[PDB]
């Protein structure tokens, strides 16, 4: 890599944010402010997304 | 050397649970 090079032959950093976006239990998480919880009343809810 | 294997090496193939059905 020399910085004369014309843009196409420029390095470039890449970064490839991979995710398991499973039924399984998470970790890596949204900022998301929780709630209390509610129960036998109809309610929206969002349990991890 | 050799043996039948029977019925093993059935795995739960998700992580979700499910009761009462015949998945497949
Ligand atoms: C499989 O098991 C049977 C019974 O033990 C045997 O006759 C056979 O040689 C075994 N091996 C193969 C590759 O079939």
Do not use: I, W
């Given at each position: 890599?020399?910085?004369?090079?014309?843009?196409?032959?420029?390095?470039?950093?890449?970064?490839?944010?991979?995710?398991?976006?499973?039924?399984?239990?998470?970790?890596?998480?949204?900022?998301?402010?929780?709630?209390?919880?509610?129960?036998?009343?109809?309610?929206?809810?969002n349990?991890?997304? | 050397?050799?043996?039948?294997?029977?019925?093993?090496?059935?795995?739960?193939?998700?992580?979700?649970?499910?009761?009462?059905?015949?998945?497949?």
């Amino acid at each position: 890599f020399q910085p004369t090079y014309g843009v196409g032959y420029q390095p470039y950093r890449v970064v490839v944010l991979s995710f398991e976006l499973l039924h399984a239990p998470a970790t890596v998480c949204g900022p998301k402010k929780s709630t209390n919880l509610v129960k036998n009343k109809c309610v929206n809810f969002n349990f991890n997304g | 050397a050799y043996t039948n294997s029977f019925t093993r090496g059935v795995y739960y193939p998700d992580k979700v649970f499910r009761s009462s059905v015949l998945h497949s």
